[PDB]
């Protein structure tokens, strides 16, 4: 009862978490999937307190 939820075990296709486009590589400083160099620029100059909110929206 209420323990019938089941997880998975399979390769997941990791997408971007700034935009919704498919992103193939992350960062060392903030660990964000990102599409290209414009999104890398906006990641590396964003005001503090939001780079954790992207991972909070992702989990």
Tell me: does residue 21 bind another protein (CB under 8 A): no
3-state secondary structure of 37: helix
Nearest to another protein of 5, 25 (CB atom): 25
> Which of the stretches 2-10, 12-20, 24-32, 49-57 binds another protein when contact is defined by CB under 8 A?
24-32
Rounded Cα distance between 6 and 22, Å, is 26
Distance of closest approach, residue 40 Cβ to another protein, in angstroms:
6
Distance of closest approach, residue 59 Cβ to another protein, in angstroms:
19
Q: How far is CA 11 from CA 14, 26, 29, 36, 50, in A?
A: 9, 17, 24, 23, 28
């Amino acid at each position: 009862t209420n323990i019938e939820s089941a997880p998975s075990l399979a390769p997941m296709k990791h997408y971007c978490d700034v935009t919704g486009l498919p992103a193939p590589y992350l960062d060392p400083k903030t660990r964000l999937r990102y599409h290209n160099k414009e999104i890398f620029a906006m990641i590396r100059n964003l005001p503090q307190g939001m780079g954790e909110q992207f991972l909070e929206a992702r989990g």
